[PDB]
Structure formats: structure tokens, C-alpha cells
Design an enzyme around this catalytic site. Structure first.
Site, PDB file in Angstrom:
ATOM      1  N   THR B  40      50.296  52.606  11.045  1.00 18.14           N
ATOM      2  CA  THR B  40      49.359  51.705  11.747  1.00 18.14           C
ATOM      3  C   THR B  40      47.985  52.376  11.684  1.00 18.14           C
ATOM      4  O   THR B  40      47.080  51.955  12.401  1.00 18.14           O
ATOM      5  CB  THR B  40      49.797  51.595  13.256  1.00 18.14           C
ATOM      6  OG1 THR B  40      50.146  52.994  13.553  1.00 18.14           O
ATOM      7  CG2 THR B  40      50.921  50.608  13.500  1.00 18.14           C
ATOM      8  N   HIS B  45      49.394  61.129  14.743  1.00 14.88           N
ATOM      9  CA  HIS B  45      48.660  61.791  15.847  1.00 14.88           C
ATOM     10  C   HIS B  45      49.640  62.539  16.704  1.00 14.88           C
ATOM     11  O   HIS B  45      50.891  62.497  16.435  1.00 14.88           O
ATOM     12  CB  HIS B  45      47.702  60.763  16.488  1.00 14.88           C
ATOM     13  CG  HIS B  45      48.439  59.663  17.158  1.00 14.88           C
ATOM     14  ND1 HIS B  45      49.312  59.932  18.206  1.00 14.88           N
ATOM     15  CD2 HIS B  45      48.479  58.325  16.963  1.00 14.88           C
ATOM     16  CE1 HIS B  45      49.853  58.816  18.638  1.00 14.88           C
ATOM     17  NE2 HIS B  45      49.391  57.836  17.862  1.00 14.88           N
ATOM     18  N   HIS B  48      53.184  61.484  17.865  1.00 12.49           N
ATOM     19  CA  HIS B  48      54.198  61.617  16.877  1.00 12.49           C
ATOM     20  C   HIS B  48      54.908  62.968  16.847  1.00 12.49           C
ATOM     21  O   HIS B  48      56.030  62.971  16.300  1.00 12.49           O
ATOM     22  CB  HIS B  48      53.575  61.457  15.462  1.00 12.49           C
ATOM     23  CG  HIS B  48      53.108  60.022  15.364  1.00 12.49           C
ATOM     24  ND1 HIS B  48      51.846  59.642  14.964  1.00 12.49           N
ATOM     25  CD2 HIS B  48      53.796  58.881  15.660  1.00 12.49           C
ATOM     26  CE1 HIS B  48      51.776  58.324  15.014  1.00 12.49           C
ATOM     27  NE2 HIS B  48      52.938  57.854  15.429  1.00 12.49           N
ATOM     28  N   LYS B  82      53.854  47.893  22.784  1.00 14.79           N
ATOM     29  CA  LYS B  82      52.528  47.213  22.658  1.00 14.79           C
ATOM     30  C   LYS B  82      52.471  46.105  23.704  1.00 14.79           C
ATOM     31  O   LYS B  82      53.463  45.368  23.891  1.00 14.79           O
ATOM     32  CB  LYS B  82      52.271  46.872  21.194  1.00 14.79           C
ATOM     33  CG  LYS B  82      52.416  48.213  20.421  1.00 14.79           C
ATOM     34  CD  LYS B  82      52.772  47.951  18.938  1.00 14.79           C
ATOM     35  CE  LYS B  82      53.524  49.172  18.307  1.00 14.79           C
ATOM     36  NZ  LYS B  82      53.006  49.122  16.899  1.00 14.79           N
ATOM     37  N   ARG B  86      49.584  42.230  17.669  1.00 11.12           N
ATOM     38  CA  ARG B  86      48.633  42.944  16.800  1.00 11.12           C
ATOM     39  C   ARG B  86      48.241  42.051  15.623  1.00 11.12           C
ATOM     40  O   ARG B  86      48.915  41.076  15.278  1.00 11.12           O
ATOM     41  CB  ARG B  86      49.165  44.291  16.320  1.00 11.12           C
ATOM     42  CG  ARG B  86      49.182  45.234  17.440  1.00 11.12           C
ATOM     43  N   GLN B 173      64.316  46.856  11.466  1.00 13.03           N
ATOM     44  CA  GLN B 173      64.658  48.256  11.848  1.00 13.03           C
ATOM     45  C   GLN B 173      66.130  48.337  12.003  1.00 13.03           C
ATOM     46  O   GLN B 173      66.730  49.394  11.793  1.00 13.03           O
ATOM     47  CB  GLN B 173      63.810  48.558  13.126  1.00 13.03           C
ATOM     48  CG  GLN B 173      64.451  49.826  13.726  1.00 13.03           C
ATOM     49  CD  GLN B 173      63.384  50.500  14.565  1.00 13.03           C
ATOM     50  OE1 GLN B 173      62.301  49.966  14.801  1.00 13.03           O
ATOM     51  NE2 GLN B 173      63.715  51.673  15.068  1.00 13.03           N
ATOM     52  N   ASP B 194      60.581  53.874  23.624  1.00 15.43           N
ATOM     53  CA  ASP B 194      60.432  52.410  23.394  1.00 15.43           C
ATOM     54  C   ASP B 194      61.271  51.930  22.234  1.00 15.43           C
ATOM     55  O   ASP B 194      61.257  50.677  22.045  1.00 15.43           O
ATOM     56  CB  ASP B 194      58.930  52.065  23.310  1.00 15.43           C
ATOM     57  CG  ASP B 194      58.284  52.899  22.225  1.00 15.43           C
ATOM     58  OD1 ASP B 194      57.190  52.690  21.705  1.00 15.43           O
ATOM     59  OD2 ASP B 194      58.951  53.901  21.882  1.00 15.43           O
ATOM     60  N   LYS B 228      46.741  59.237  30.476  1.00 12.96           N
ATOM     61  CA  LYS B 228      47.370  59.141  29.157  1.00 12.96           C
ATOM     62  C   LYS B 228      47.321  60.431  28.316  1.00 12.96           C
ATOM     63  O   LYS B 228      46.234  60.964  28.085  1.00 12.96           O
ATOM     64  CB  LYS B 228      46.757  58.016  28.329  1.00 12.96           C
ATOM     65  CG  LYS B 228      47.586  57.788  27.188  1.00 12.96           C
ATOM     66  N   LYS B 231      44.920  61.518  24.682  1.00 10.24           N
ATOM     67  CA  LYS B 231      43.695  60.710  24.730  1.00 10.24           C
ATOM     68  C   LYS B 231      42.464  61.548  25.071  1.00 10.24           C
ATOM     69  O   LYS B 231      42.420  61.914  26.263  1.00 10.24           O
ATOM     70  CB  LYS B 231      43.884  59.696  25.895  1.00 10.24           C
ATOM     71  N   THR B 232      41.587  61.769  24.129  1.00 10.74           N
ATOM     72  CA  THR B 232      40.358  62.541  24.359  1.00 10.74           C
ATOM     73  C   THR B 232      39.246  61.567  24.758  1.00 10.74           C
ATOM     74  O   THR B 232      39.508  60.372  25.017  1.00 10.74           O
ATOM     75  CB  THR B 232      40.039  63.217  23.039  1.00 10.74           C
TER      76      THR B 232
HETATM   77  N1  LIG Z   1      59.302  50.878  14.824  1.00 10.55           N
HETATM   78  C1  LIG Z   1      59.038  52.319  14.800  1.00 10.55           C
HETATM   79  C2  LIG Z   1      59.081  52.934  13.361  1.00 10.55           C
HETATM   80  C3  LIG Z   1      60.350  52.625  12.628  1.00 10.55           C
HETATM   81  C4  LIG Z   1      60.343  51.890  11.482  1.00 10.55           C
HETATM   82  C5  LIG Z   1      61.509  51.595  10.751  1.00 10.55           C
HETATM   83  C6  LIG Z   1      62.714  52.047  11.252  1.00 10.55           C
HETATM   84  O1  LIG Z   1      63.834  51.737  10.514  1.00 10.55           O
HETATM   85  C7  LIG Z   1      62.780  52.805  12.423  1.00 10.55           C
HETATM   86  C8  LIG Z   1      61.623  53.113  13.106  1.00 10.55           C
HETATM   87  C9  LIG Z   1      57.688  52.654  15.460  1.00 10.55           C
HETATM   88  O2  LIG Z   1      56.868  51.755  15.684  1.00 10.55           O
HETATM   89  O3  LIG Z   1      57.475  53.867  15.698  1.00 10.55           O
END
Ligand SMILES: N[C@@H](Cc1ccc(O)cc1)C(=O)O
Ligand SMILES: N[C@@H](Cc1ccc(O)cc1)C(=O)O
Lengths: 311, 317
Positions: B40, B45, B48, B82, B86, B173, B194, B228, B231-232
């Protein structure tokens, strides 16, 4: 205008998206319309006649009909008007059927007329190759899950349950509406009553994607006695002369009940307003005669089977 | 067994489908696991890191990590976490981002190991080519609208509005889980909190499709102040030493809230219980030395950027 009114007089209009707008389009221009048929069997049956015959009334009025065989949608399944989830047919099976249905359809339309030749299309052509990514972004993004959940076809099955496959079906028919509008100038879609939701979805799709189109639905065929139409004890009356013979077929029409007969002349025949009324008078004045029923049976049999089969 | 016990100890385990069943595979086998990352943006960051350093802890225990780059799900968007819909990124962009994100995962994992080299995958490979009809027949048939509707990513947006596009994300997914299961023996999927919804949908697919597999999620990273995490004033702390410099990076860490410091040592470093505890005593016993924060900052900086960079950050700072 006069076609819309006639249809109206014939009792072939259940609902329309904008009556005044359609009527002005009909009277002004040469309209390109469509109606789709999903292969759910190897034959169309009398329940599809209303919709096909209506496509032909439009062709007689000078419009350009496109019959669409759901080669792709037929693999998914329309929950529309179904009370329960359906089993998936095999591609090989749906493919075979398509071919058969494609043939039947072609008996009702003129592919050689000038100005408005008919067309037969198969949605497999544009859906067959659609990848998931494009579909979700290009079609999917324009629809909210709410919009979708409020459709009768889903609202009806929420206690029962519905699969994501069948819930998605409306996006597919929505997409057909959009493609045909784009490539064919199609601005009108007709269908049976249960198609209202799928029809209005296609329209929403064009609207959010473009910025000019209509929907119209045909009422289900009714039996004055309150029974179910095309329902015999030899089962289904098919348009397949090998499943249901001309004889059998013709006999069905002739046995139409007096209370039903004129309504049926209006729905199913190409007789004029004036001609049908005569028949009405004769039924009043001499029903033992059974003239209306005999005309119905010959008219319908010719249309479906030809003059030779009539003999 | 022990890996669970320590994940648990570091407070890295939020939820697991079957602990008992999982602890058993881990102790009993060499588990192939995966974690997905959606591009995205051009860089990952520090939001992660916990999932990436966890993948690494697994690999250390001897399991084989698969990080999947959301080549294709990155073009759909996950509604999870979210609060609104988006905008669709464009392909050329997302793909530009994937190449970049593919290079950062690469430094936290070992491709060289013996027994469990890490693997990096891109779901565009199996989803790029999927056609609507196979998708809808083969995947779709297995999921009821009710099942999807009860998800938090959806329930959460029924107010604000969710497109069919974001609605459908979980099928993709779930399909990744299945695909990895079938082609790579992948039996465990991890992600942040999430992802719980998306992880369980994957297991439903498999179960409904095959008749064996687990899910685990890591807790969301918090601040004792309730603000948060990550977040800077400058925005986000990136892992890209060209978005956020090593110095900027380092400074971010030496600056952790005393309340936040031990927790972060647990999630973000490869130190021992033993060592963590030490630094903790130090902090009760002498909090102005700012002992803790220094190690943390040194530790995370070395992991992310290497010692040369640490050298330098320590210098101009
Ligand atoms: N949906 C996850 C990323 C993801 C993508 C594909 C997958 O099969 C699994 C996880 C995220 O937004 O972080
Ligand atoms: N879904 C309709 C037929 C149909 C198929 C495709 C279309 O684009 C339109 C209509 C039915 O079940 O009868």
C-alpha cells in the site's frame, strides 16, 4: 407509445424503470433491447414464450433484439426466483445446452431484416476471459454490499442461506447490461418479473460508470383457476419437438380453459386488438364452438413449430 | 512447545485457533508458515516489524518462513483495520511497490539456512490468472454470505459502507492459505490482530475443500500513553533508509516512553529473558541512565540497517 400501450393492453408489462422516458425512446428511435436465457435444461419450455414473443413484438415494431444465452452465468446460477441454493452444472453440460437453446431462440427472430436484424449472443464471450482482479475493481467497486443485500433474490434467502457464488450472480448480469450497452447501443433490457433486481443492478452499473437506459418486466403467466402455467400431468410442455410433440403441444393449447383463453390470445399471439375482440364476442355468443382455443393452438403451434408441423 | 512458550512470554501471541494442536506440530515437525504483506506504499514501516521479527523467531526455531507480497490483493485492498473504503491503487504502482517490499523482507530472513531457507512469494502468480468463473465456482461456493457478514472487517463498515470489492478481499487471502497449503505444505499462517478474520476464512476454505492447519495473530503495538504507535510529527517511521534515515530511525527508538521500553525489548529484539530482565532491574534501579532505550535503539537499528549505519547514527546524533 403505441407499442408500450399495446404491450400494456396485452398485459405484458409488470414494471418499467421510467415509462414516459421509454415510451419517448420507442417512438423516436430504433431501440436495441436484450433479454437473456440461462441454460438450465436442454430445452426452453412454454414459460419462456412470453419473454421471447415479446422480444418479437419489439422486432415487429422496428426495434433491434438481441437474445442472450448465458453460457457463463449458467455456470453460477441465478437465485432469482429460486427458493434454495442450486447445484452447479458442469461446463460440458451447460455448453451442450447452450447450443440447443441457441437454436430455439433463433426460430423466433429475424436475422435478415434490414435496419433491425436480430442477434444471438453468448455471455461466455466476455465473462469467460474475465480475470478476478478486473471484475472486482472494474465492476465490484461500484456496488455496496447493502445495495446488494436489499435485492429480493438475496433478501429472500437470508434465512435459508446463500453462497457468495449466487449472491455475485447479479454483478455478472449487471456486466452483460453494461457490455451490450457499450458494444451494441443496448438501452433496454426485458425479463420476467423476478429479474427486476438484476435489471436495476445493470442500470446502476452503467450509471455509475457512464452517465441512458431502461428496464421493463413481464408478468408471470397466470391461470384463472389459480393453478400453475405449463403444468400438465405429462409434465412440462417443451419447445423441443422431441420432448413434446407438435400434437402434444397443440393439444395443450386447445384445452385452454375458457376463462383463460382470451388472456392467452393477448400474451401469445400476434393477432390484432380488433381480431382478439371478435373472438371474445364468439366465446360469449358461442363457446361450444371453442373458436378462440382453436386459433390459439394454431397460432402458437405455427410460431413454435412452423406451418408444416401444424398440418 | 518452547517457541510458543516464549512467544507467549514476549507477549507476541494474541490468538491461536488451536494452541494445543499447534504446540504439538511445532515440537513434532518443521512447520512451513507464511505471513502476507500488501504493498500500500513503497516501503514497509515499523508497524510491520513485529510480524517480520516473529517470522524470524520461527525460522530460528527451525521452521520455514514464507513471506507473501500482495501482488494481487494489493490491487483489491483489505478492509481489515481500515475505518473506510480506500482508493484503488493502479497496477504499475503496486507492482513498483512490490519489487521494493520484496527487497526489505529479504533482509530479515535467511535464504541460505540448512533445512529451512526462507522463501518470498507474490500472490499475483496464482491470482493474476484466476478467471471469475473458477473463482466463483471453486472458492465462492464454500462461503455463505452469512459467514462473511459476521466478520469484523465487515460488521465494522456496515455503517460506513463497504464495496463488494473490499467485501470479497477475504476470499483472496483465504485462497492464498489454500494455495500455500497445497503447493508448499503450509500449515500455519500468522499476522497482526486484524487479520484474525481473514486467517479463519482461509481455514474454512481448506476444511470445506480438503477435510491440519493453524492460525496465530500477534497483538497490535501499543503505547502506555494510549497514542498511536509509530507515528512521528514527520509522519511514519519507514524501514527505507531513504524515507527515514538511520539517525532519524535511531532517535525514534532512544526516545521510547519508559513505560513502553521493556515491552518493546520483548517484541523487537533477539535478547534473552535473562537479558531483558536485567535491563528492567536497571530501569527500576536507575532510569536516568536510559539504559533500556539505548540497547533497544541499538538492537533495532542494527537489525534494520546493519552496524555501519548504527555507527553513524550514534555519531551525528
Ligand atoms: N491482508 C494483509 C496482507 C496479506 C495478503 C495476502 C495474504 O494471503 C495474507 C495476508 C494485510 O493487509 O496486511
Ligand atoms: N438470470 C436470468 C437470465 C439472464 C442471464 C444473463 C443476462 O445478462 C440477463 C438475463 C435467468 O435466470 O433467467
Amino acid at each position: 407509445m403505441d407499442l408500450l400501450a399495446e404491450l400494456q393492453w396485452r398485459g405484458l408489462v409488470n414494471q418499467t424503470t421510467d415509462e414516459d422516458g421509454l415510451r419517448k425512446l420507442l417512438n423516436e428511435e430504433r431501440v436495441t433491447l436484450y433479454c437473456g436465457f440461462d441454460p438450465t435444461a436442454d430445452s426452453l419450455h412454454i414459460g419462456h414464450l412470453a419473454t421471447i414473443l415479446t422480444m418479437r413484438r419489439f422486432q415487429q415494431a422496428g426495434h433491434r433484439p438481441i437474445a442472450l444465452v448465458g453460457g457463463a452465468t449458467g455456470l453460477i446460477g441465478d437465485p432469482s426466483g429460486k427458493k434454495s441454493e442450486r447445484t452447479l452444472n458442469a461446463k460440458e453440460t451447460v455448453e451442450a445446452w447452450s447450443a440447443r437453446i441457441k437454436e430455439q431462440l433463433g426460430r423466433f427472430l429475424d436475422f435478415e431484416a434490414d435496419g433491425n436484424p436480430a442477434k444471438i449472443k453468448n455471455n461466455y464471450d466476455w465473462i469467460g476471459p474475465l480475470d478476478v482482479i478486473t471484475f472486482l475493481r472494474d465492476v465490484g467497486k461500484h456496488f455496496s454490499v447493502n445495495y446488494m443485500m436489499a435485492k429480493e433474490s438475496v433478501q429472500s434467502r437470508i434465512e435459508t442461506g446463500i453462497s457468495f457464488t449466487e449472491f455475485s450472480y447479479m454483478m455478472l448480469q449487471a456486466y452483460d447490461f453494461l457490455r451490450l450497452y457499450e458494444t451494441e447501443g443496448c438501452r433496454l433490457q426485458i425479463g420476467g418479473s423476478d429479474q427486476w433486481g438484476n435489471i436495476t443492478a445493470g442500470l446502476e452499473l452503467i450509471r455509475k460508470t457512464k452517465g441512458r437506459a431502461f428496464g421493463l418486466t413481464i408478468p408471470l403467466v397466470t391461470k384463472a383457476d389459480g393453478t400453475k402455467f405449463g403444468k400438465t400431468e405429462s409434465g412440462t410442455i417443451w419447445l423441443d419437438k422431441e420432448k413434446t410433440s407438435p400434437y402434444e403441444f397443440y393439444q395443450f393449447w386447445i384445452n385452454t380453459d375458457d376463462r383463460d383463453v382470451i388472456r392467452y390470445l393477448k400474451y401469445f399471439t400476434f393477432l390484432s386488438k380488433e381480431e382478439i375482440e371478435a373472438l371474445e364476442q364468439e366465446l360469449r355468443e358461442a363457446p361450444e364452438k371453442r373458436a378462440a382455443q382453436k386459433t390459439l393452438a394454431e397460432e402458437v403451434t405455427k410460431l413454435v413449430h412452423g406451418e408444416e408441423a401444424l398440418r
